[PDB]
Amino acid sequence: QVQLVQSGAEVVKPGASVKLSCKASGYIFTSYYMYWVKQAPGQGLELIGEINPSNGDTNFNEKFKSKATLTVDKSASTAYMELSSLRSEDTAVYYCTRSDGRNDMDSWGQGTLVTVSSASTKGPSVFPLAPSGGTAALGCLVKDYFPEPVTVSWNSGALTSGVHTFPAVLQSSGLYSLSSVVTVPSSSLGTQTYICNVNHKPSNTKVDKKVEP
Amino acid sequence: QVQLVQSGAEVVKPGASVKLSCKASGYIFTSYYMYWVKQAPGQGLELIGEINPSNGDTNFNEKFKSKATLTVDKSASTAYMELSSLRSEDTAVYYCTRSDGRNDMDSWGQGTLVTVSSASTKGPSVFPLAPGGTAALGCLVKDYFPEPVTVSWNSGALTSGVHTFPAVLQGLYSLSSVVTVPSSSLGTQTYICNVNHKPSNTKVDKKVEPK
Amino acid sequence: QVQLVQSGAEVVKPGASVKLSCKASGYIFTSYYMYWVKQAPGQGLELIGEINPSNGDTNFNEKFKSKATLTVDKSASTAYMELSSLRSEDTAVYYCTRSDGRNDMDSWGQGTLVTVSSASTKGPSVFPLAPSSGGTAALGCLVKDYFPEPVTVSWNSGALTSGVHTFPAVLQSSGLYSLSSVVTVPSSSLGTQTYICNVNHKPSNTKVDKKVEP
Amino acid sequence: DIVLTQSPATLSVSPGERATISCRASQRVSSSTYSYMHWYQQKPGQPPKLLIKYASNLESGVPARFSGSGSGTDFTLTISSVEPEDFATYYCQHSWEXPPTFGGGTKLEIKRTVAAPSVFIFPPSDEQLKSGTASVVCLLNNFYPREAKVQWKVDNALQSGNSQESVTEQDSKDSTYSLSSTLTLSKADYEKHKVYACEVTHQGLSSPVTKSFNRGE
Amino acid sequence: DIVLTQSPATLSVSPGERATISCRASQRVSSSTYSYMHWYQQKPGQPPKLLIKYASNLESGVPARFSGSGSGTDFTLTISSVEPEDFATYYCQHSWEXPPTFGGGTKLEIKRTVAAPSVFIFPPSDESVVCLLNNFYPREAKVQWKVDNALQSGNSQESVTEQDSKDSTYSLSSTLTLSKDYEKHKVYACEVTHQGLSSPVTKSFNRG
Amino acid sequence: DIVLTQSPATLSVSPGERATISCRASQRVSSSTYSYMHWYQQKPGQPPKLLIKYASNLESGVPARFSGSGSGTDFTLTISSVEPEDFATYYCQHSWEXPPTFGGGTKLEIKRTVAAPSVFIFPPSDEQLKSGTASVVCLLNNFYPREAKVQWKVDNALQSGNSQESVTEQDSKDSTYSLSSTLTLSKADYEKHKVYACEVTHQGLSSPVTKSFNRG
Amino acid sequence: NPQIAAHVISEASSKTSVLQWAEKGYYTMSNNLVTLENGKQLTVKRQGLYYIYAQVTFCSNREASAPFIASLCLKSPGRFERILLRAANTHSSAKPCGQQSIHLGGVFELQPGASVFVNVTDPSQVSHGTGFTSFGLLKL
Amino acid sequence: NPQIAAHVISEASSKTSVLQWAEKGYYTMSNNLVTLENGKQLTVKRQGLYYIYAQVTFCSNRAPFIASLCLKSPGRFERILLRAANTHSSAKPCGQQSIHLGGVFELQPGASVFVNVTDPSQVSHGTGFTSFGLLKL
Amino acid sequence: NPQIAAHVISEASSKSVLQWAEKGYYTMSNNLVTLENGKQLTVKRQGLYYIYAQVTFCSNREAPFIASLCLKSPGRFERILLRAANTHSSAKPCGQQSIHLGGVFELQPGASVFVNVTDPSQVSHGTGFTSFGLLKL
Lengths: 213, 211, 214, 217, 208, 216, 140, 137, 137
Ligand SMILES: *[C@@H]1O[C@H](CO)[C@@H](O)[C@H](O)[C@H]1NC(C)=O
Ligand SMILES: *[C@@H]1O[C@H](CO)[C@@H](O)[C@H](O)[C@H]1NC(C)=O
Ligand SMILES: *[C@@H]1O[C@H](CO)[C@@H](O)[C@H](O)[C@H]1NC(C)=O
Prior knowledge:
Number of strands of chain D: 18
Strand content of chain G: over 45%
CATH class of the largest domain in chain D: Mainly Beta
Largest interface: A-D, 43 and 46 residues
CATH topology of the largest domain in chain D: Immunoglobulin-like
Distance between the termini of chain G: 11 Å
Oligomer: heterononamer
Bound molecules: 2-acetamido-2-deoxy-beta-D-glucopyranose
Shape of chain G: globular
Helix content of chain G: under 10%
Radius of gyration of chain D: 23 Å
Strand order of the largest sheet of chain D: 2-10-9-4-5-6
CATH architecture of the largest domain in chain D: Sandwich
CATH superfamily of the largest domain in chain D: Immunoglobulins
Largest sheet of chain D: 6 strands, mixed
Number of domains of chain D: 2
Structural class of chain G: mainly beta
Order of helices and strands of chain G: EEEEEEEEEEE
Radius of gyration of chain G: 15 Å
Number of domains of chain G: 1
Helix content of chain D: under 10%
Order of helices and strands of chain D: EEEEEEEEEEEHEEEEEHEE
Number of helices of chain G: 0
């Protein structure tokens, strides 16, 4: 199998550098060009540049010429990209991809999330959205955590019907926030117990919050 | 006097390499191109490649590009050719030659014989060729390696009417030496062939009489 | 201010070499081409060659290809020219000049005189040019057989300057210089005033006060 | 640089429906023999996957229902009959000159009938408001299509710098969207106002629906 | 690669006779000013010697009786009057492009009258069947081996001498080699065909 | 190499007079946009100074009375109204190809009325004769213009190759020249002759003037 | 008579010693009387004199690799291929590689259906960045 | 129809990565249908196929030296047509190296070509070393 | 009007000026250009010509190799039209390097161009390495 395996997610402060790696197997590494491609949250794909692994020759998209250094280690079948003077606009998933002819890109790595933020690892505040006719809505506002992600289950996974957990938004504070919401029968309120289970694995925190009317 | 002096004959096994030299005198060594030329027993002059002695720049006949390496030592006024991966088909005389303009080749070395054979040195067996007014007799010199074999009659007293044939390759060599004399003289005169093979240190003397 | 300052005069024998310097200030040294120019006594200007101070790249006038070597020291904003196997024909003022475009030469050094001679240092003999125009008498001092230039001449220790003509030195075929200094005075004054030429030759440390008599 | 404009931004289809999407290049990317235009599928959180190379060549192992056509400035990608795993974003890419650029993408979305949102409003929690900030949440539940207008009003003053929206991906069971609008104020600003109202405009509603509370009560 | 074909394979001439030999190239090797064709002499055991360069230029020190002519694809070398020292093989060579190639050679041979071979057969000694063709001209001769009237092929090898220094004739040996298979047959015969013989001559023995 | 011929060799002008000098190149040094011709001023003992670049461009800091014109093979430099500091030699230079070459120069000289030289002859000193050499000196004092012929005669034999002249620059107050011609002889040769004469030719004199002495 | 000229852009291939080319970017292909065939060769329909040129930039390291040689080759109908023009270059010792460029060009007689192509010692070391490597011809 | 060709000679400047040029020495400018503008670019009046070339000699001592033949067409951004590189020499004070660029391009009316390098101060201006030209097919 | 063009192949000599031959895949369209004395291309007709040379050389650096395209016009001294440099390789026994020169020049009736180099004995003569030609526009 042709495989490009990229290094793990990086969370770093503005001004820092990271070195991303991309390990190639299942093909002759020196026979294919490699590209690096940027995908900023919610956006499309932007080419950073290209490396020939047989010699280390590079060509950059003008935009990234002072941002990005590309190298290979032939012996390790690995391509690296170093990003320098990182700033919040450098926040994106970065892909390596091989190309037989510098036309199509036929196999891609899984991507490496680089998050650049002043923020420090922080578990969320969890606030009730306390419960309009036959159906009631209730939820938990999961506020001010870093980095992503949080997961939310309800009644330890016994309640799944009508659950909606929203994608996180980045606030102007630099911290993420999301709500988890469920619709239930109005008649069930204050006889049934509704507990949101909020896990933030990056801060190793599990918060249970009873939501009552 | 312009001279090109080549190194001595070489007898070698298949898979061996040899390095041939060509020592130039009586001219400005770096002013002439040098060529190496192959002449197989059954040939035929064949160009191997060329070297510029000023800088060691080479061009090859595509047939010999994986067979031959050309160098010069300017100090020694010497050109060298290394032949690797030798097969029996590399058996040939190899010449070096000089060329003022890569056109005519105006001076040639005396040539260097390279013999490639999985045969081993072995001295000859000698069998008599026993006899109108003229009789023929001779000696069969069978199953030697490598060349040459030499052949004399009655210790060099009998030359006239003697024919010593070029040797024939079978992977050992074989030739006959023959002579014609008066049928009358088969009584009066006695006939012995003197065979000498210096590579094996053999010297056989075979009497040839009516048999 | 843009300035090129050249090294002091050289007096050398044939077969010698000299290394002339040209120190640039008040501009970015590596941004301008530099030329060296020869001006032989009484003669015009002759290009020797050009150097790019940025990298040391040179182009020569074919005539000077064996005679001149051009280098720079970027860190010292200085250009150098070495002149080899010097002969009497190399006797000249040599200029360095800068050029923004290898077209006009917008700034020149003050010049370095190179004198090539087999002669050795020698103080002059001072001979009177004895006076008698009509009403005007001429007198003077023949300042003969010195090397190298210059001599200075004054009259009555600098109090007589009117009508004084001190001629340019001539090179004789001995390799020694000669010049005359003259003054015109009223004939009337020849029995009233004393006329003394004051000749100094710094190189030989020679000083001569010569009374010029009828 | 070459710009690639894909149309539509969103294409709504059902499984078993044909889908065609288009890509228009700022200049021709075709010559004698080849078109330098390629097509990719991307699912959220996954890398792009090549489908079509040089306008019309199916990549090895890509299902036969994918095809590409076009020349010059104009290229199409067609899925002959859509399957559930085809719902994704599709990107075109040229390789005509440096740098290669990508289109802005076409989302292939699951078509279903129009559904009105159920609208609910949430005052900030007492635990949050004590701590100096008030998040007011407006929930739009299970609507289709995606297009919704949420306007916040505080004592009937239209708000604008101080809300953020988040939307789910289509529901696995009913193919609807849900949306949260969160209005953030300081404790002080929150407490100087009485009526907090979420007004929702959506094609499923006969007229805009407003959900409000009075601070307290 | 350019192919050079020389004609004739052998030219028989006497001393004091004119000899002209030719070289045909597979393509033109002439342009405005020069023809890139050269000619060499080679004697057995000796290196080639340059005679003529660029079709028509006599090499320094080469005798005036040698000349060259031609253009395009066709070149000749002429010896105005052959001398004993001229009997040799002659080779043409081009230098038009890489690689330089040489012709297959023309043997300049000593012309004399037709002479029939004397034919002799030798049985293998008690202590290989040998057939000798002695002092014949010209070189062309067919030797057929028969064993009990059955034509042999190819269990024989031939060797030939250079032209004799005194009579200008050739001698030839043909050697039939067999397993001791030899004892399975009675009559061993060497049949020789040569234009000097009115009909083919057969020398034979019986084993015994 | 390109040759530049400047005319005239000498131009005589007064302060307040217009001066135009010319430079002729052996081949065209102009193309579509520029002429590769430059002009310089040089005073004795001073380096050249750039005045005009590319035929017509006044070098920054150079006074407005300097101007240049021309194209192809022919170029002029004009001073609209000469000032005392303008008397100097002027040189043209091309930058068309390698090497750059310069004209032979035009001397801008101070014009004044013709003045005849006062001629004086000086026998060798007693002091010098004692040491085996005799220099005889002929002085031409305060004449204009520059052109003067000095012929040495010994017992009426015209002398060749045993004289040298030197000339001053124009006098700062009256703009005249002075010239010395020195005849050098051995004491032995000097002693073989009686009459030593300097004959001077100059347009200021109605006919050649001879000054002479008798040895002793 | 129509103007006959071609200029094609370098293309990488994971596949040879023969360089590959494409009609893309600022290419020229004045008509069907010159064709780029199989991405590899410019083929002319008309006999006559043509100016033929190639540009090869490569990026190599001396230690990490005999010179780099680029060859302009001709295949005429009924003839074996041959070299028309050739250039060499020492490998740089810059790390991870140093770029060098070769330019070849000259006037040749072409036969109808003749094809020219470019061969190199190591096609993987060729620089494909904008403008670095190109191939073309024009009919005189 | 007139012949349209230009050959211009390298010119140093104390001023940028764009090389300067002059109509001097053994230059060619066949008519007003090609002009050298601002000493920096050859500008063509007539649409058509042109063979365009440049050679640049530089003198350097040890990023490669790169020379680029650029096109500015009306209504279009600048673009590179041809580029050649050469490693810096180790020779002292500098080592000379040469680049040649050339090829056939379609030009639009009023199109301009120019030559850019990594270091214009390192270019050799000696007779014949550095030149730029074009001919209309 | 006939096409006028030439392409000649490098030739070694045991005797600065490169030698050439009409051999291999050479061009000489007619007698209006001639290769004279193996050393120079001479044109009969005035006009604009594109003139080119490539020289491959094999040297060891243990100072640059310069190749010059030179013009001899009737009644004029020889002059350099184009020049290229390349530092010597340090490869043993020698490293190959190549220079290419080309540009458009006015030639006069009877004008001759020729190629000069620092070291003719170092020139590579292998197939295709070294050649010289011109074409009349
Ligand atoms: C060049 O390329 C290929 C190797 O891929 C080879 O088969 C061909 O013969 C070569 N041709 C020449 C003329 O070198
Ligand atoms: C060439 O150089 C100039 C800087 O002098 C720059 O502004 C221009 O964009 C460059 N052009 C290209 C096409 O690189
Ligand atoms: C070229 O080389 C020859 C020496 O063989 C010399 O006479 C000639 O002047 C040279 N010309 C130039 C222009 O370098």
